[PDB]
Amino acid sequence: NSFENLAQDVNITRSGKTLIAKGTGGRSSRTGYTATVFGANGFLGSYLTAKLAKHGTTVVVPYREEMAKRHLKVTGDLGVVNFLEMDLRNLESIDEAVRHSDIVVNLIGREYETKNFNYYDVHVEGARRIAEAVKKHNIARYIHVSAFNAEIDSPSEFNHTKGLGEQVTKDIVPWATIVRPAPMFGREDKWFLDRMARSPCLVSANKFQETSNPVHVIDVAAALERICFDDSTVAQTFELYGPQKFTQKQIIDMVSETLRKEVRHIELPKALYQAYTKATQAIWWPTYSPDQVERQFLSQKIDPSAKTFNDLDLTPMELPDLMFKLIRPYR
Amino acid sequence: KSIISYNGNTIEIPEEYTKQAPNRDSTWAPAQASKTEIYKNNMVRFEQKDLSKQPMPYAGIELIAQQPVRFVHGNTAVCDGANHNGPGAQGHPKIFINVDAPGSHACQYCGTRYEKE
Amino acid sequence: MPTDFPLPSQQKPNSAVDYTLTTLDAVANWARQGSFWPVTFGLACCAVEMMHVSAPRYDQDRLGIIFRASPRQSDIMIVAGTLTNKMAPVLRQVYDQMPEPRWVISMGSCANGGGYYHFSYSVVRGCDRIVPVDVYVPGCPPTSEALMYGVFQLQRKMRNTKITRMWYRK
Amino acid sequence: AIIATAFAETVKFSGSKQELQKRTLALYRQFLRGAPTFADLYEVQFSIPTIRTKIRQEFERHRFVDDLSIQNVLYAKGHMEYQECINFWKQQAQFLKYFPEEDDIQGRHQPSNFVDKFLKNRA
Amino acid sequence: MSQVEPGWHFWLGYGVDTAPCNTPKEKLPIRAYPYKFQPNYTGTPGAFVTYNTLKPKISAWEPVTKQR
Amino acid sequence: AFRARPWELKKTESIDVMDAVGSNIRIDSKGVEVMRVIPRVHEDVNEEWINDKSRFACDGLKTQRLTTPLIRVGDKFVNATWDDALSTIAKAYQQKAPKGDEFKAVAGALVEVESMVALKDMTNALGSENTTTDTPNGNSAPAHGITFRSNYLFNSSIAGIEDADAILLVGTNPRREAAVMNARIRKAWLRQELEIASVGPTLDATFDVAELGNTHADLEKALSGEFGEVLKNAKNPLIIVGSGITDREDAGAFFNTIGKFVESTPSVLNENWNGYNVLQRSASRAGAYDIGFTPSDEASKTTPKMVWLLGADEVAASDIPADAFVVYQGHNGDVGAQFADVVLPGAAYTEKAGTYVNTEGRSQISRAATGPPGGAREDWKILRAVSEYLGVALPYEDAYEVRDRLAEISPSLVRYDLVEPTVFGDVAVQHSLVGPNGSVTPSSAPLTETIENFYMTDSISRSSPTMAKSSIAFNKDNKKNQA
Amino acid sequence: REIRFHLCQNGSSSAPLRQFVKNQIGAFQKANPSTKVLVREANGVKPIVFARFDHGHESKIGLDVSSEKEVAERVKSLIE
């Protein structure tokens, strides 16, 4: 059981705290990094703090609900994972949750508006609210994540607000490190494969030709942890794109050739498409978003001036290699 | 009160809990690890938690010091600490104390100090 | 959005909507509290005590506990007895085919942190390393009184589930 | 318990190195024949020739043992692991012991020189 | 349970004939300090937290330079 | 007093240091700290006894240790990345560039033979044999031969002191330096009938001394006075010399008299033993003199630019240049760490698989009782990486390859704990005579005491608070007085 | 730069080297006052000279050899 996490043993952090990873790196060992992951119950967060607590970094987990917080205890030893509740609203809870954190990330992004939160709330406002306290506490290695196609421009209010949040993270505590991953695929992803696994309709616009290169989620998590600890990451925008660009027809045919089923196809245009998604907001379980409509006409706008996987010595995998595994139990 | 959390950030607990005891503020061991070291160690699992409902177990070094120093008529004292109500064998075992030197002498189990007079 | 907001541990109903949601939450948590179906996992010296709860001194039917020994009908699982290396994938698999409003409770001292077999070779050092356990029942013969008390502790946690109040995202 | 299980044999000790070699050759043929059954049964992520190139190199590990009887205990252990894998007796968690290196590419800073050993004082 | 006083908790589980309101004061354990009665606060933020009572084994050395 | 309890303990047989005899000890350790030391029995070297300072030294072994590398900012040290320290070493090497006779390498009192091998290899692959001891008047050769091991060792057996007849100390307190030796002296003096002379400092022995003087001229008067007859008469005498005279610049004529006398008397210099017997204050300067840890006459001249501290507490601000690069490598915080630019936490004598040579010459293994705590490492492993960030390639990476390199320096150090005699008596004494012959002009400097106090030396008696409170109670006190 | 060599203190196969260091050191130290000798012994070795140069690079030779001048031939060879 070795530290494949770190480069070394003894690390002073940027803020000047001394960290000595005693023991041999396993679950019982201690590394010393006090980390905080906002929104860790989310799909990226589980795989993230799994590898983050695999080497015994103390992970402060803020949660929102008391039920989904429980299945992240198993990836840490005693004192490794800890839990505390908070709202995005109450600033004192933000203030409290990051007091001893060496490092901290925020994967807070919600693809639909609630009746209590919009995109302007949870992307540009709350990120300001938390990284203000990061600036107040001189917390080292602050990482912010935004999505792909995070512009200043209109047509997706989500994507309109993601770049606003990026500019706010560049504004205050200005050395903050920004990462933009690709679309993601994993076992039970949010809307990209399990929506394509079972679907009574399978309708969307564009005639299925928006382009991107999806990344396996565990590669994003390993990439993030390899970011987390070294130098040469500070204040650098990070495009994290898969090995080869796809189209939706290519993706869905690759899914259906392993399912050996007729995945349905409707592909009706935008007008009748919008008003059906309008009525789904009143339902408490999450449905396809009326602003997810807009991103279907959008595609992967890659910034060339960023730093890839091969910056940090990693090669992610290709989706055709994984297609038998992930939608295996729907056979 | 405000102690440095290894980063220049200060953590702020009330003076009712910068205490070794409700009876004593100061440490009594070479490796006692005062509470000012302890919150400095892991406040990580102390946030969002009450400060009142931890033990604070009424440390003994203050309680033993205000017991009256007894007197012994002869030379050699005996200490048991056993009650005379309890039907059994309690207290510390029957060791004896020489009290000859100037000053009292604590029985090394019970801590009661005896004096020859 | 308000910069100050009360914690969900500290909040009180003030809107009439909140009275409605809190009473509906109480009905849901209440039916979850009364009807209470664990699964017979027990395997060792920590399983006879599980049967001692079914005995006519410390009844569980008066509590609504009944052992539907079929994990698809089970609300929770009682990990009881020691946990070996050879078994542990079966423990994970039995945890897998359970419905979503689930818990699991660690009856027995071997079941948390190894217990008396903490230094054996073919043993899991407590069922923390497999399933996320919410209540531990200590005691190496973990007392029927203590096991029931662990259930009442879990039922207090069930009273504080807030499945309805979180739709308002409090 | 008069009768055995399906593939279990009475253990018997070959007197010659050649008879041991004959049994090992038949044994590798048995693994190699039952290998596509394993990927179905243990539901593994990866492909059948990876199983085959492990089963080859595991016998490559013990190609160069001199003794008759140490190869005899080695053959008996191999036959028992065949006996386990041909049934449901191992489970897929225990079946995937044999590929630690395949499932995860190791991680950043695998120590190679003296210095990478030294900076983490040999892990 | 465990919201009851100890000297009662014995009698509730039938340890004694004589409930502690009727015991003689000779069987009262004399104490030189007041009593507080924390029942249990599991899950409540008044839950017990652990820590090692003693300091680290080896103290470091403080940096004291010496201008030659 | 009550810290542990003898079934909890892990025991480990090992070697004492901060003592010239290197007594065979046992370390009781709980597993992180070091609980106590108890002398394991051995016939020759200690007869199941141990020094007092050897006993209570475990306090400083756990209270002031270097746990991380600290780099000077300028009147301030901050701890830093373990790369950053050694990268600063390479960077400031490229800044200063000592091309030769400007890389001072000094080792200390309790330092490893195996570590000083790495030291000498690094310095002379670097291209400078500025390789000097910690002692004042250590900046030259120690006024006698590094050749002919007899020049720096104890040539009789320690077992031969039972057979001793009549000896004389010069410039030493053998009650202080190697008190185990004093136990042997008093046992001999009670058992047989002996005669001791003492030249130099007036000490309080347990036994009966006979003082002679406080001058090398008084010494030279005493050699030709009456004991030129006695030591010629005596069957198995010896003559015993402390290391404090190495401090005196007039050591060589101080050798040249006594080196004549051993040459002149064939009773003190026969085949089966040799009467010239010297001691050290350390457990390591004997091992260092096996290494060849001496500067040249050319290397004694140039003020360095890059001073290497390896232990070596008793340097002064006078012994160091102004702008010098002074990277300390040690275990605790002493004067040597106070002057430093970068400190390097190296393991102490407990944590490492040490190898030590006493004044008798016994090569002895120090089995490691625990791991190096915090961020300390083993010493020669640090020197390997320090070589790697320079152009120096040390040809080893393991312990066995060090053992073979150490066998290359001297095969008597891999052949452990077996005392050989020297077949070169007369040639060795003569070659010790010819070197410092005549050129040393002995002054009338009085033979003052070698050490200030016994219980305050060697960076651990100063580290341990128990030896501070030992030191205060032990000078002319009314409870420590006799009458 | 330095030089060392090692004998065995038993009188076997190091005796010409033994008498070489009995005699030739008073001439060799004067012949090379810059570099340095040192002698050690370990109860049985092969008689062997190790010398270190002006690099830290060293060289070696094994002295199963006849007489003192036969030692000196190998020594003079080993210096250059």
Ligand SMILES: NC(=O)C1=CN([C@@H]2O[C@H](COP(=O)(O)OP(=O)(O)OC[C@H]3O[C@@H](n4cnc5c(N)ncnc54)[C@H](OP(=O)(O)O)[C@@H]3O)[C@@H](O)[C@H]2O)C=CC1
């Ligand atoms: N392919 C994709 O899905 C892409 C996603 N991203 C971004 O990566 C991050 C994680 O990805 P993913 O796992 O898919 O999405 P998530 O499921 O993680 O998004 C929701 C997470 O953030 C929390 N969250 C949202 N709003 C709030 C709020 N007001 N208060 C507290 N928590 C809140 C959620 O809390 P709770 O746990 O209670 O639900 C949950 O933890 C997201 O920020 C996403 O925008 C970027 C590029 C690709």
Ligand code: SF4
């Ligand atoms: S709790 Fe006690 S009885 Fe049960 S498995 Fe553990 S040791 Fe056995």
Ligand SMILES: [Zn+2]
């Ligand atoms: Zn007593």
